[PDB]
Structures are given as C-alpha cells and as structure tokens.
Design a protein around this ligand. Structure first.
Ligand SMILES: Nc1ncnc2c1ncn2[C@@H]1O[C@H](COP(=O)(O)OP(=O)(O)O)[C@@H](O)[C@H]1O
Ligand SMILES: CC(=O)C1=C(O)N2[C@H](C1=O)[C@H]1c3c[nH]c4cccc(c34)C[C@H]1C2(C)C
Ligand SMILES: [Mg+2]
Length: 994
C-alpha cells in the first residue's frame, strides 16, 4: 500500500480487509506473503578471498607473467633424476611473486563492508502482531511480517516495517528517526491523514519507518509496506543500482596494462622478423627442438624486462603511508585508493551547520516595539554579548548595559522564550563548561533568558550547576505549561498553552505563547504589544518589523530570527482537537506580536581561509543548507563563497526553486551553482549526478541513511566523526572533527600523494623501457643475453623498489595548491615526456649492452676478442674461426652478466635522483633534499654488494664480484645519463614553454 499516510485510518483497514480488533486471518498471511514476499532486505551477493585471488589472475599482464612461468618450465627439462641442485629458480621466483602480488591486491586492499550491508543492522529480528488465530500479541520474526497485519510498538522497540499508525494508546507517542536524519531529538506522531499524496518523510507524521525506535509511548498501527518497499528499503535499492566507477589512476593504469600486453607480443614477432634468415639455413645441423627452445628464453626475458613488478608493492606502500598521514590531519580515509582520487577533487558540497559552522548557536540581537502612532513605528532594540551557552554576558541598549526587566516588553520576550522552550542548559563538571540539552536553537533561547534575568533573581550566589537554569525556573513558577503544539515545517511555528499558578496578576484566562519563523508568525498577529498595552497591527508597523528582520538576516550579521507572539485570549481548553496537527495553525491565530530575537551559528574560524585556498586550488565549493535563501547567500559571502558585492542571481537556489526547473536547466544550474537553501536529501543525489554529467570529481558531505545514497554516488562521500553508523559506512572519508577545512587539507595531501606517484610510476617504467631495449639488442645483434630473468626480478622488486618508495616522500611544491585540479583525462606519459623516456630507455638499452659485451670485447682478464662475430655463432658446432683452444662455454660466464647488472643498478640510482622533480635541474633541485632517497640508494647498493660476496647468492644470480677496474667502467658508462637528463630538463623548461 503506497500512499498510506494520505488515507484515513479506516481507508487503510478497508484496503487490506482487516479488522483492527482481530487482525489478519492465517489465510491472508499466506496469500499475502505470496504477493509481497518477506519483510527482509535481499541477501548479500557474496564474496570470498579465493575467487578474489582468481579474479586478479584474469588480468592481461598477470596472464603474461604466468605464461612466462609456463615457458620458464618448458625450457629446462622433464621429470626426476639426481642433482644439479642450483637450477629451478626462474620459474619458482615468478610464481612466488605472483601469489605475493595477488595477495597484496586484497588483505591490504580492503574490499569488505558496504553501506548496503550495514542496512542489515537496523532491520530488526522480532516484531509484535495481532493475528486472528490467537487473541494475544504474538511476537514473530520481523522477516515474516507482511503488508496489512496489525502491529504493536512500545517504547524501546525498533519499528519492524513501514506502518500507518492506527491508534496511540499512550498519552503521546515519540519516535526516534535518527537513523534517517541524525538529529537526536525525537518526533511526535499522530493519526490524522497527511492528505498530500506526495509528502516528504518529514511531514508524514502518522507513519513509522522500519528501522526507527519508539522513544516514548506505545501504539498500534497497520503495516503499509515491508521488505524493499519501505523508506529505508528504497534507500537500500538506490545504492544497489549505483555503478561504482574505478579511480582516475586504476583507469589509466588499466589501459597501460593493455598497451604493455600489446607491445610484448609485438616485439616477440619483431624479433622473428629479424631471425627470418634462419629459413635459409641447412636442413641438417643446429638444434631443431633447440631452435624452438631459444626463442623462448628471449620471450621470457622480454616478459620480465617490461614489467615493473614492484609497482604494486610500491603503490600499496605509498597509499598506506598516506592514510596514516591524513589521519594526523583528522581525515579518516577508508577505501585505500580513495587517496589518489582525493587529489582530483573538483567540487565540494558541504553541509553548513557543524562543518562550515560550529553549531554553537547564540542570540545576540533582539527587539520589541517602542511606540506606534500612525506611521511612526519606532523599535526598541538591544544586543546580547557572549558566544557560549554560558549564562555569562550582558544585554545592552545603545551599546551600553541596561537592566533588562525595566522594559515591560523584554519581560514578555523572555517569558515566551522560557515557556515555549523544550530544551535546557546543563553545567558539565568534567570539561568545566555548559552543555546544551536538546535543540541548539532552543538552548540558545534558554541561555538568553538567563543573561536577560528579567526578574532580578539573585544569581551570583548560586553555583555553576544551579545557575545554569536559574531564571528559566523562576519563570516556570509564573506560568504552568498545560499542553504544547509541536513545530511543523507546515506552519513553521510552535506554541505552548499556559495557565497562571500562585498569587500573580494574569487572570481572566490563560495564554498561548507562539514562537516560530517570522512572516509565519507575523502574518498571524492582529495585535502588536507596545509595553504592557496592545494596539492593532498596521501596515507601517508590519513593514518596520519586516524591514529589520530582513536587515538582520540578510545583513553581514547573517542572523536567524524568531518571532515571538502570544494569543492573549486563547480558545477554550475543550475546543482544540489536540490530535489534529492540521488544526494547530488555526489555534495559533489572532496573535499579538511581542518581538523578535536573532541568533548566530558562527562559521568555523578555520573555514574562511580554507575557502580561499580552494579558490586558488581551482576547486568549487557548494554549501547546502537550511537557512532561507536570503540568509543562505549572506552566510556564503561571510565565508567568502561569494564576493562581498557580487552577482549571484542564478548561483543560489532553493529546494522548491530547483524542483521547478525542467531537467536541462537543473543540469545547467549545477555547474554555476554554489549554494542550495532548504533542500531535500533527495536533491543531494540529483546534484552529484549532474556534477558528473560534467566529469567533475565530487566530494559531498552528508549524514543519516537519508544521505547514504549520495555519499555512495559521490566519488568522495564524506561522513562526520559525530555522524551515524550507516552514514560512515557509506562514505570513503570521515572527518574525525567534523571540520570543513579537514576536507580541504585532505584534498591537498591527496594532491601531493598523486604528484609523487606520477613520479615513481614513470621511474619504475623508465627502467622497463631500458631493460627491454637491452634484450632487444642482445637478440637483434645475436650476442649472449646480457641480462637474465632472476637478475631483473631483483632489480624491479628490490633494486628500484626502495628508491621508488622513497620518492614518495618528496617535498611538495610551494604552489601545489595554486594550480587548477588535474583532469581525469590526463595521461601519465605524453608529449615531450614520451620522448624523454624513450631516450632514457634507449640509453639504458645501450649502456647495459655496451659495458657487458665490453667484457667480451675490450677487457683485460676476460676473453677480449674484438669483433669476434658474436653475432655469427653461439652454436660452436663448427669451432672453425677459433682454431687452437678448447673453451666455448665462456659465453655463459658470470663476469659479463655482472657488467650489465652493475650498469643498470647504478644508472637506476642516478635516474632516481633525476626523478626528485620533473623540470627542476639537479642544480636547482639538489639531490640531498629527499634525505630518504639518498638513504634508499645507500641501501640499494649495499644489496648489489651483498648478492656478490655472500657466496650462495652470486652463485644463484649467476654472478661474480667485479674488479676495481670493472667498477670504474660502470661509472664511466653509467653517470653520463644524469647529463642526458639535464639537457632535456632545461629544454622543456625553455623552448617548450608558453
Ligand atoms: N526542506 C526544508 N523545508 C523547510 N525548512 C527546512 C528544510 N530543511 C531543513 N529545514 C529547517 O532548516 C533548519 C536548519 O537546517 P540545518 O541546520 O542546515 O540542517 P542540517 O542538519 O541539514 O545542516 C532545520 O532545523 C529545519 O528546521
Ligand atoms: C597477481 C596480481 O594480482 C598482480 C601482479 O602480480 N601484478 C599486477 C597485478 O595486479 C600486474 C598488472 C596488471 N596491470 C598492471 C599495470 C602496471 C603494472 C602491473 C600491472 C604489474 C603486474 C604484476 C604481474 C606485477
Ligand atoms: Mg546537517
């Protein structure tokens, strides 16, 4: 049953053909349960760390390194015999690494709880129904409740499904819809039909939402809807249908994988296009099976040479070192990768209260009527001092303390403020400061009537706790509060019925004390109180009163105002239908305006500047809020969302305004919009959506399951420390302190973490372009492979591994925040940056081939046969060009391999320095700025040395320590790269700029 709130109580029974007294027949419970299904949310879709690992191996590159592991096996030999112990490492090291890389994409790549799974913690187990096949209140599994059947809720219950209230058995009924909203204060319910078919949840005051708690009272009602069809069930369903996109990194990293997988099997057919000459060899001679086996050593070599295998380990380290770093600045980031996407944040929508402002509301201007004669309408207006809830501060007229109670009207102003108030102060003994109890707005009122002190109650001889609510009390002695008519968005006010108590003066009857939004309250006064007299409300009087409320609210004070009026002669106690919330506004009529108080909710000292920081960072801030559009805008100026004078006509919208536009101009309104006043949570989704239709990366605050759907949709959902459970689960980032500037900080950190990533990502790659171009020479010119698998793995995992990581501690630009947000269409390698890493890659693919074969050519202690056609023969089936002598097998010597390896490692340690900045010379950007890059190189070399003289290692790497003459040739052929680099830096600096 869909629009239940809008049907009469009988209409709802007539709809399910059920008797409020008896309940659902055990037949109906059958047919129904068939029509509607069970009162549960669909079961989890499932996961598992075994199919999670299997999912990682389906990737293209991890398909290749696993193919190279297959070939690494079909290269050696068959099944068991005896021992040449040393051998099978090359296929076992990769298979080790892959498992230790799949694993790293999981148990520190958190992929676990979702805000959708959280929504199975506010669906209850047990509910209480009245079916026909008993007579007592049979408690059943919530899961088995179903539309139509009668239900019983009492204080402390979790509401089991969405329920149209039938009758309230207790005095009143108070529900706690925190989960949806977040606003501790419970709400009153009634049974009248809310007759508008499309009423928001805030206004469905005869309904209980599944997941809510009864906070007082006890009622019986009929289930309107269950399962996915309840209000919380529908929020579940929106988050279900959300397509969750990958980050701008994992997206362009994935098309790097595809580009790398395409290049490998393009070189593995390009090497073939150069060995096509083998078709001209004799049918007899050389090794058939052997022919096949060769091409498979270079394939495997080409596999490992273009990977960068460390990458994963490095990234993960870098991100996990970012999380710990943002947590210090109060940003809890939950999703790992979120830290990179945090860096392209284009737009930030923040809630006002609590994030932009401190929710420390206090009154600080107020006025009453002074005198009224024809047109002259003079006001009598004061100011209050004190930002806190503490009863410390003073009232001043004409900028100078006055004793509040000498003004008759100020008495009334305080009387209403105290009696028409549902909140209160408390002194906290621990912190040593006052506490609000209830609404912030109301508690501010309670603090006022304290500062005011209209009766001159002795207050300085009281104690911190006793005095908090002192004068309020005195006033609660004066009038007795019978009943009270709660607030409703609908009439925008609230009022309490009061009768006098002891030997007072009031008499002849009692009064209603109304307190609500202006116009609302003012449009309902026929009389104005001037002093203790009263006179009829006139145009000129009204126009004053409004002119000032407008000035205060829309001024540079940005005050929120309340009108305070009284019904001097109220309806008879037995004339008002107190269950009929719809009729509350008529009882609040024919009021007498008493006066207006205006309060403030100060913007965080921090935010002002933070906002500016985003201006310069090129990122847009949108402030969502609940103030009226006028004051909404005025707060925007004050925090500098807008300039103090500038146009804003089509830049701020309200809830209703925004709804009145057809989609095209809603979509439009979103790229220029900065401020939304009085919005539905419904809109937060629509706004995120629209912002994305503009490829904006959107940070979005919100709390309560109401805002869960948009914290999901937003690239960066942001919950609050103080927030609800579910909201947090829906976000990717949580402000431990709720501060808006905590967002801004985190976006800058994320800006820096991505910048440093762009670096070491290109560094680790820079090697792989070299390592290949090396093995392309050692194959294209037919020498002996200067580098093999088990060497390269060490370089990519460990040799470059420590320096790449240490490049994640680089000192961030001093204009890191003074440049526009980086696009999500930026490629990590492009323009002059491609030809700079095809040079450095084309230089390493030469220097590792030069100095190694140089041991086969120009060496002293090595067989130095210059131009000995190493290209012609590595078969030695002939042994004709080498007449006398008996030794071929020196082509598998450890020393030449050790020449290439020492060239690489050292160039890498050079190129690591070349990364510390993109276009600053090592002259301008000193190598000793990153103390952790120097520290890493240090540890990198002392590993190149370790694997050379601790004998097990150099035997396994197939190496042997080079002589001191074989150490200088390295530095002769290695260092020159820092020189090729600098030339490129000062060029892109000085002829590729403009
Ligand atoms: N859509 C609306 N229509 C009318 N008034 C509203 C609406 N949204 C909120 N308000 C009022 O605005 C007041 C201030 O909202 P605010 O403190 O911004 O809310 P929030 O917790 O969303 O920040 C709320 O107390 C509520 O009384
Ligand atoms: C077993 C496992 O899950 C993984 C891995 O073990 N790896 C990565 C990978 O995801 C591989 C990969 C996929 N896409 C890219 C882009 C850039 C770099 C890499 C990759 C490294 C790859 C490898 C094999 C190290
Ligand atoms: Mg809020």
């Amino acid at each position: 049953m869909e629009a239940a709130h809008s049907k009469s109580t009988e209409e709802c029974l007539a709809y399910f053909g059920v008797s409020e007294t008896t309940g659902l027949t055990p037949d109906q419970v059958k047919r129904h349960l068939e029509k509607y299904g069970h009162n549960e949310l669909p079961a989890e879709e499932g996961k598992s760390l075994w199919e999670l690992v299997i999912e990682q191996f389906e990737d293209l590159l991890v398909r290749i390194l696993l193919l190279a592991a297959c070939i690494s096996f079909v290269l050696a030999w068959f099944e068991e015999g005896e021992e040449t112990i040393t051998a099978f490492v090359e296929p076992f090291v990769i298979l080790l690494i892959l498992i230790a890389n799949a694993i790293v994409g999981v148990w520190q790549e958190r992929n676990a709880e979702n805000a959708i799974e959280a929504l199975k913690e506010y669906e209850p187990e047990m509910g209480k129904v009245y079916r026909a096949d008993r007579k007592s209140v049979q408690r059943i599994k919530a899961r088995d409740i179903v539309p139509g059947d009668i239900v019983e809720v009492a204080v402390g219950d979790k509401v089991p499904a969405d329920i149209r209230i039938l009758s309230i058995k207790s005095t009143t009924l108070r529900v706690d819809q925190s989960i949806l909203t977040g606003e501790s204060v419970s709400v009153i319910k009634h049974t009248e039909p809310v007759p508008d078919p499309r009423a928001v949840n805030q206004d469905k005051k005869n309904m209980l939402f599944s997941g809510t708690n009864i906070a007082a009272g006890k009622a019986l009602g009929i289930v309107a809807t269950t399962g996915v069809s309840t209000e919380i069930g529908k929020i579940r369903d929106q988050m279900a249908a959300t397509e969750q996109d990958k980050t701008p990194l994992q997206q362009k990293l994935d098309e790097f994988g595809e580009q790398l997988s395409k290049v490998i099997s393009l070189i593995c057919v390009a090497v073939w296009l150069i060995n096509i000459g083998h078709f001209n060899d004799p049918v007899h001679g050389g090794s058939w099976i052997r022919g096949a086996i060769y091409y498979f050593k270079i394939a495997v070599a080409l596999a490992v040479a273009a990977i960068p295998e460390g990458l994963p380990a490095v990234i993960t380290t870098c991100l996990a070192l970012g999380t710990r770093r943002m947590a210090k600045k109060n940003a809890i980031v939950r999703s790992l990768p979120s830290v990179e996407t945090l860096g392209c944040t284009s737009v930030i929508c923040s809630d006002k209260t609590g994030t932009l402002t401190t929710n420390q509301m206090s009154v600080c201007k107020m006025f009453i009527i002074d005198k009224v004669d024809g047109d002259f309408c003079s006001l009598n207006e004061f100011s209050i001092t004190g930002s806190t809830y503490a009863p410390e501060g003073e009232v001043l007229k004409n900028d100078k303390p006055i004793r509040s109670g000498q003004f008759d009207g100020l008495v009334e102003l305080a009387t209403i403020c105290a009696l028409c108030n549902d909140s209160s102060l408390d002194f906290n003994e621990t912190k040593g400061v006052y506490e609000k109890v209830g609404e912030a707005t109301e508690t501010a009122l309670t603090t006022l009537v304290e500062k005011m002190n209209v009766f001159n109650t002795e207050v300085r001889n009281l104690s911190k706790v006793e005095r908090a609510n002192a004068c309020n009390s005195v006033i609660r002695q004066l009038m007795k509060k019978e009943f009270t008519l709660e607030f409703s968005r609908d009439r925008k006010s609230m009022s309490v019925y009061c009768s006098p108590a002891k030997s007072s003066r009031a008499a002849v009857g009692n009064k209603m004390f109304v307190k609500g939004a202006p116009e609302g309250v003012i449009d309902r006064c026929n009389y104005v109180r001037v002093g203790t007299t009263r006179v009829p409300m006139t145009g000129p009087v009204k126009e004053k009163i409004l002119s000032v409320i407008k000035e205060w609210g829309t001024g540079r004070d940005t005050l929120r105002c309340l009108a305070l009026a009284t019904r001097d002669t109220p309806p008879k106690r037995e004339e008002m239908v107190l269950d009929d919330s719809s009729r509350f506004m008529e009882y609040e009529t024919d009021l007498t305006f008493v006066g207006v108080v205006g309060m403030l909710d100060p913007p965080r000292k921090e935010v002002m500047g933070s906002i500016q920081l985003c201006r310069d960072a090129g990122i847009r801030v949108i402030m969502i809020t609940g103030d009226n559009k006028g004051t909404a805008i005025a707060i925007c100026r004050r925090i500098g969302i807008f300039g103090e004078n500038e146009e804003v006509a089509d830049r701020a919208y309200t809830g209703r305004e925004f709804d009145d536009l057809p989609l095209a101009e809603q979509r439009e309104a979103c790229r220029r919009a900065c401020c939304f006043a009085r919005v539905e949570p419904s809109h937060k989704s629509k706004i995120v959506e629209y912002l994305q239709s503009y490829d904006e990366i959107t940070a979005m605050t919100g709390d309560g399951v109401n805002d869960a759907p948009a914290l999901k949709k937003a690239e960066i959902g942001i919950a609050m420390g103080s927030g609800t459970a579910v909201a947090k689960t829906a976000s990717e980032m949580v402000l431990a302190d709720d501060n808006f500037s905590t967002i801004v900080a985190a976006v800058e950190e994320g800006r820096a973490i991505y910048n440093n990533m762009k670096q070491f990502i290109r560094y680790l790659i820079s090697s792989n372009v070299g390592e290949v171009v090396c093995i392309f020479l050692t194959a294209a010119l037919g020498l002996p492979e200067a580098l093999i698998p088990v060497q390269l793995l060490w370089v990519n995992l460990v040799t470059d591994g420590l320096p790449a990581t240490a490049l994640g501690f680089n000192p961030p630009d001093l204009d890191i925040m003074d440049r526009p947000p980086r696009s999500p269409k930026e490629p990590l390698i492009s323009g002059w940056l491609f030809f700079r890493y095809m040079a450095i890659g084309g230089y390493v693919g030469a220097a590792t081939v030069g100095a190694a074969a140089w041991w086969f050519m120009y060496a002293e202690d090595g067989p130095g046969v210059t131009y000995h056609q190493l290209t012609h023969f590595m078969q030695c089936t002939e042994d004709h060009p080498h007449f006398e002598g008996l030794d071929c097998e020196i082509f598998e010597a450890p020393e030449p391999m050790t020449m290439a390896l020492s060239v690489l490692v050292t160039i890498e340690m050079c190129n690591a320095l070349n990364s510390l900045s993109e276009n600053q010379s090592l002259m301008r950007m000193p190598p000793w700025v990153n103390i952790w890059l120097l520290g890493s190189i240090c540890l990198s070399m002392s590993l190149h040395f370790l694997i050379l003289y601790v004998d097990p290692l150099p035997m396994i790497f197939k190496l042997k320590a080079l002589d001191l003459t074989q150490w200088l040739m390295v530095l002769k052929i290695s260092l020159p790269v820092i020189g090729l680099d600098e030339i490129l830096k000062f060029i892109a600096r000085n002829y590729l700029e403009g």
